Design a protein around this motif. Structure first.
Motif, PDB file in Angstrom:
ATOM      1  N   UNK A 116     -40.550  27.087  41.925  1.00 31.86           N
ATOM      2  CA  UNK A 116     -41.580  27.085  40.803  1.00 31.86           C
ATOM      3  C   UNK A 116     -40.762  26.760  39.386  1.00 31.86           C
ATOM      4  N   UNK A 117     -41.193  25.638  38.746  1.00 29.75           N
ATOM      5  CA  UNK A 117     -40.560  24.997  37.569  1.00 29.75           C
ATOM      6  C   UNK A 117     -40.103  26.119  36.706  1.00 29.75           C
ATOM      7  N   UNK A 118     -40.887  26.949  36.401  1.00 24.76           N
ATOM      8  CA  UNK A 118     -40.778  28.104  35.345  1.00 24.76           C
ATOM      9  C   UNK A 118     -39.360  28.807  35.383  1.00 24.76           C
ATOM     10  N   UNK A 119     -39.373  29.165  36.783  1.00 25.59           N
ATOM     11  CA  UNK A 119     -38.157  29.882  37.030  1.00 25.59           C
ATOM     12  C   UNK A 119     -36.700  29.144  36.762  1.00 25.59           C
ATOM     13  N   UNK A 120     -36.584  27.873  36.920  1.00 26.04           N
ATOM     14  CA  UNK A 120     -35.563  27.059  36.437  1.00 26.04           C
ATOM     15  C   UNK A 120     -35.521  27.075  35.016  1.00 26.04           C
ATOM     16  N   UNK A 121     -36.649  26.937  34.358  1.00 28.92           N
ATOM     17  CA  UNK A 121     -36.549  27.037  32.999  1.00 28.92           C
ATOM     18  C   UNK A 121     -35.841  28.352  32.397  1.00 28.92           C
ATOM     19  N   UNK A 122     -36.298  29.547  33.135  1.00 33.78           N
ATOM     20  CA  UNK A 122     -35.773  30.871  32.780  1.00 33.78           C
ATOM     21  C   UNK A 122     -34.377  31.178  33.140  1.00 33.78           C
ATOM     22  N   UNK A 123     -34.155  30.579  34.402  1.00 33.31           N
ATOM     23  CA  UNK A 123     -32.794  30.845  34.677  1.00 33.31           C
ATOM     24  C   UNK A 123     -31.724  30.149  34.021  1.00 33.31           C
ATOM     25  N   UNK A 124     -32.111  28.914  33.971  1.00 36.72           N
ATOM     26  CA  UNK A 124     -30.996  28.194  33.295  1.00 36.72           C
ATOM     27  C   UNK A 124     -30.951  28.487  31.758  1.00 36.72           C
ATOM     28  N   UNK A 125     -32.290  28.639  31.150  1.00 27.43           N
ATOM     29  CA  UNK A 125     -32.062  28.969  30.042  1.00 27.43           C
ATOM     30  C   UNK A 125     -31.581  30.535  29.685  1.00 27.43           C
ATOM     31  N   UNK A 126     -31.714  31.357  30.668  1.00 31.95           N
ATOM     32  CA  UNK A 126     -30.885  32.679  30.801  1.00 31.95           C
ATOM     33  C   UNK A 126     -29.172  32.080  30.779  1.00 31.95           C
ATOM     34  N   UNK A 127     -29.073  31.616  31.722  1.00 33.56           N
ATOM     35  CA  UNK A 127     -27.690  30.952  31.598  1.00 33.56           C
ATOM     36  C   UNK A 127     -27.246  30.442  30.334  1.00 33.56           C
ATOM     37  N   UNK A 128     -28.166  29.590  29.689  1.00 35.92           N
ATOM     38  CA  UNK A 128     -27.861  29.079  28.289  1.00 35.92           C
ATOM     39  C   UNK A 128     -27.508  29.742  27.369  1.00 35.92           C
ATOM     40  N   UNK A 129     -28.460  31.060  27.342  1.00 31.06           N
ATOM     41  CA  UNK A 129     -28.346  31.787  26.009  1.00 31.06           C
ATOM     42  C   UNK A 129     -26.860  32.280  25.710  1.00 31.06           C
ATOM     43  N   UNK A 130     -25.924  32.323  27.017  1.00 34.02           N
ATOM     44  CA  UNK A 130     -24.791  32.576  26.705  1.00 34.02           C
ATOM     45  C   UNK A 130     -24.048  31.664  25.899  1.00 34.02           C
ATOM     46  N   UNK A 131     -24.351  30.451  25.974  1.00 29.25           N
ATOM     47  CA  UNK A 131     -24.231  29.389  24.999  1.00 29.25           C
ATOM     48  C   UNK A 131     -24.780  29.222  23.758  1.00 29.25           C
ATOM     49  N   UNK A 132     -25.811  30.038  23.513  1.00 28.88           N
ATOM     50  CA  UNK A 132     -26.605  29.828  22.396  1.00 28.88           C
ATOM     51  C   UNK A 132     -25.811  30.046  21.201  1.00 28.88           C
ATOM     52  N   UNK A 133     -25.682  28.991  20.328  1.00 30.95           N
ATOM     53  CA  UNK A 133     -24.963  28.987  19.143  1.00 30.95           C
ATOM     54  C   UNK A 133     -26.051  29.182  18.177  1.00 30.95           C
ATOM     55  N   UNK A 134     -27.408  28.813  18.483  1.00 30.76           N
ATOM     56  CA  UNK A 134     -28.338  29.115  17.481  1.00 30.76           C
ATOM     57  C   UNK A 134     -29.795  29.195  18.303  1.00 30.76           C
ATOM     58  N   UNK A 135     -30.542  30.282  17.436  1.00 28.87           N
ATOM     59  CA  UNK A 135     -31.849  30.330  18.045  1.00 28.87           C
ATOM     60  C   UNK A 135     -32.621  29.022  17.933  1.00 28.87           C
ATOM     61  N   UNK A 136     -32.391  28.184  16.957  1.00 28.27           N
ATOM     62  CA  UNK A 136     -32.815  26.958  17.012  1.00 28.27           C
ATOM     63  C   UNK A 136     -32.469  26.077  18.065  1.00 28.27           C
ATOM     64  N   UNK A 137     -31.114  26.482  18.635  1.00 25.97           N
ATOM     65  CA  UNK A 137     -30.548  25.605  19.816  1.00 25.97           C
ATOM     66  C   UNK A 137     -31.413  26.477  21.059  1.00 25.97           C
ATOM     67  N   UNK A 138     -31.785  27.625  20.905  1.00 26.60           N
ATOM     68  CA  UNK A 138     -32.393  28.182  21.918  1.00 26.60           C
ATOM     69  C   UNK A 138     -33.893  27.441  22.139  1.00 26.60           C
ATOM     70  N   UNK A 139     -34.404  27.242  21.037  1.00 31.39           N
ATOM     71  CA  UNK A 139     -35.638  26.533  21.223  1.00 31.39           C
ATOM     72  C   UNK A 139     -35.502  25.056  21.391  1.00 31.39           C
ATOM     73  N   UNK A 140     -34.467  24.568  20.884  1.00 25.96           N
ATOM     74  CA  UNK A 140     -34.189  23.078  21.195  1.00 25.96           C
ATOM     75  C   UNK A 140     -33.817  22.948  22.611  1.00 25.96           C
ATOM     76  N   UNK A 141     -32.929  23.713  23.267  1.00 26.26           N
ATOM     77  CA  UNK A 141     -32.835  23.677  24.575  1.00 26.26           C
ATOM     78  C   UNK A 141     -34.099  23.800  25.377  1.00 26.26           C
ATOM     79  N   UNK A 142     -34.778  24.931  25.111  1.00 26.68           N
ATOM     80  CA  UNK A 142     -35.983  25.073  25.445  1.00 26.68           C
ATOM     81  C   UNK A 142     -36.957  23.926  25.450  1.00 26.68           C
TER      82      UNK A 142
END
Lengths: 123, 71
Positions: free
Chosen positions: B21-47
């Motif tokens: 289910x596509x959302x699960x990848x979005x959420x798991x890899x954005x979960x992974x990615x938050x570790x590298x979140x250098x900005x909330x703008x980057x959170x929203x950009x990677x999202x």
């Protein structure tokens, strides 16, 4: 330029060269250039020439793939959209050639007589 | 974007094989990615680019959808 200017100062019997007389030395080259007004191979052959060519090519291939639900692009439809978007005139022979290139480059993977299926570029 | 595209390709490959289910990848890899979140703008950009990419391999070639109920 070197050897040549050396002839110039050879004339006039100069054992050392003026920085001058090199001017015309250049100028003379600039003459065929001034005769060039009114290497090339590559230039034509880069997109917009051949890079342009294959680029659009792949581009389209990708497109008709996408719109095919990834199924193969046809020789025909290929030629059709490729002359269709018309402009830079992709001749179906040239088409055939570049196609051959990408496929053979394994920048494409396709086949049939009147059937050109699509590609998979692995390279 | 091609380099980013390459990276995202990597995260996607990784999460895909690893998930296997596509959302699960979005959420798991954005979960992974938050570790590298250098900005909330980057959170929203990677999202944003994940959403766009998903949008791309869904709206375009690379996907498979077995039954639209789930798919």
């Amino acid at each position: 330029m070197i050897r040549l200017a050396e002839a110039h100062a050879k004339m006039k019997l100069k054992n050392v060269v003026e920085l001058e007389d090199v001017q015309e030395a250049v100028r003379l080259i600039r003459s065929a250039i001034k005769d060039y007004a009114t290497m090339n191979l590559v230039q034509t052959g880069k997109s917009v020439i051949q890079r342009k060519l294959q680029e659009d090519l792949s581009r389209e291939i990708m497109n008709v793939l996408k719109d095919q639900a990834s199924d193969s692009m046809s020789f025909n439809e290929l030629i059709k959209q490729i002359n269709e978007h018309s402009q830079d005139r992709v001749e179906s022979s040239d088409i055939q050639e570049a196609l051959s290139r990408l496929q053979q480059e394994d920048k494409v993977i396709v086949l049939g007589e009147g059937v050109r299926r699509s590609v998979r570029l692995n390279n | 974007y091609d380099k980013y595209v390459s990276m995202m390709n990597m995260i996607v490959r990784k999460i895909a094989e690893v998930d296997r289910t596509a959302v699960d990848i979005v959420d798991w890899y954005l979960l992974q990615k938050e570790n590298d979140l250098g900005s909330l703008a980057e959170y929203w950009e990677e999202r944003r680019l994940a959403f766009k990419v998903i949008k791309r391999l869904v709206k375009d070639r690379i996907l498979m959808e077995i039954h639209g109920t789930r798919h």
